[PDB]
Design a binder for this molecule. Structure first.
Ligand SMILES: N[C@@H](CCC(=O)N[C@@H](CSCc1ccccc1)C(=O)NCC(=O)O)C(=O)O
Ligand SMILES: N[C@@H](CCC(=O)N[C@@H](CSCc1ccccc1)C(=O)NCC(=O)O)C(=O)O
Lengths: 221, 221
């Protein structure tokens, strides 16, 4: 209990951006998986989850419960949040555009089957016209290697993680965006991220039929 | 252009928590309203909106675009974000539970009319069982006047703003939560917030038939 213990089920879900921030920061974590609905209710009843939900992360003696509260703490603790407030204002504006798009991709497996391909067509229109041009534009304006202060931050890890999810959606979207392609390569070869991308890591896979089935059972949605 | 200029339409919407944070911090702002869809496209074409959307806030020479990026900057600039990172980790966990609930109430006027009362019944179940007990519990644990460091922060203004929206939904929900009732009274009598609650302020009203009509026209949803 010096190693962060991330409480969640065995899936990408809402824990994955934390798994990537901690691993890129070189921190080693421990995971306690929720296998059943009763695993989640025990957690609730013991007073571990402030709003009855997970992600939950035991770190520095706190039972931290919200995604954005978990990430903001880790990003500050490990110097991945910029040097001053004008610098983390640019990081929050970029990474919140990334969480808007990321929420669309995250929830797409739960979409009503009629809607599913209309939603997917809308997510590809947003990537082409709105989100990727915006980020191509900040990398093109300063011509530096990193999104914000010519120093690695959480905006780069949160953006590259998303570029991996968009590549699984359709590997053709990124092709007209050369500076994003370059940033993906670059952050993917950093030793901490490279370790994480390798075959034995705590990194999780796409949601399939059986994970979504387990997710509906545990979280009763 | 020393006064922040908040760009949005003339409604509560996603700008209202900024209107409350700035006003409680004693800052005076200016508002440029979007009246039409073309008012929004001019803004887009001039390169003011990074992801083609509003809220947008011109502050300290930045055209800041995301809600959480706007609020995090103002809250840091005006000392409303806690003293250290363990203190803003508690503020982010509390205020993100408040934004979950607040998103439900915000979007309720746009819900499909079949669904509307089932959604409203669900929001009242969440308030009674999940969100208000959680906050009653932190005020009861330390017995202090403020949610986080016995000093006013953004967690108190964001929570009281919500207690006003829940009171318009159903004035009976808060009654079994005495310490929240007390915090509402207390923050409402601070001179900056009191000024804002008074009849001539930049504070906005509930969404009605005609505001939602104007909102669908400007934002094409
Ligand atoms: N805003 C919260 C959201 C948390 C949340 O919704 N958690 C879900 C689990 S994450 C849900 C999920 C499942 C499948 C795919 C994506 C997300 C949960 O615990 N549900 C039980 C409850 O509400 O009582 C956060 O970011 O931490
Ligand atoms: N995550 C963004 C969300 C921004 C957003 O959705 N903005 C809307 C305006 S806010 C929408 C709204 C309307 C009525 C009631 C609640 C919210 C917008 O500009 N839409 C145009 C577009 O997407 O191209 C934020 O927090 O800033």
């Amino acid at each position: 209990a010096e190693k962060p213990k991330l409480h969640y089920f065995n899936a990408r879900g809402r824990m994955e951006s934390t798994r990537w921030l901690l691993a890129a920061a070189g921190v080693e974590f421990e995971e306690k998986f929720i296998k059943s609905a009763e695993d989640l209710d025990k957690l609730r009843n013991d007073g571990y989850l402030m709003f009855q939900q997970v992600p939950m992360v035991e770190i520095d003696g706190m039972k931290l419960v919200q995604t954005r509260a978990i990430l903001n703490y880790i990003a500050s603790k490990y110097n991945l949040y910029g040097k001053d407030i004008k610098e983390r204002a640019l990081i929050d504006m970029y990474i919140e555009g990334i969480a808007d798009l990321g929420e669309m991709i995250l929830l797409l497996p739960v979409c009503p089957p009629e809607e599913k391909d209309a939603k997917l067509a809308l997510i590809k229109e947003k990537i082409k016209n709105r989100y990727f041009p915006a980020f191509e534009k900040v990398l093109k304006s300063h011509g530096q290697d990193y999104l914000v202060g010519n120093k690695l931050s959480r905006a780069d890890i949160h953006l590259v993680e998303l570029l991996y999810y968009v590549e699984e959606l359709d590997s053709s979207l990124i092709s007209s965006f050369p500076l994003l392609k370059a940033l993906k390569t670059r952050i993917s070869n950093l030793p901490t991220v490279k370790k994480f991308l390798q075959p034995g890591s705590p990194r999780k896979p796409p949601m399939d039929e059986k994970s979504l089935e387990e997710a509906r059972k545990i979280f009763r949605f």
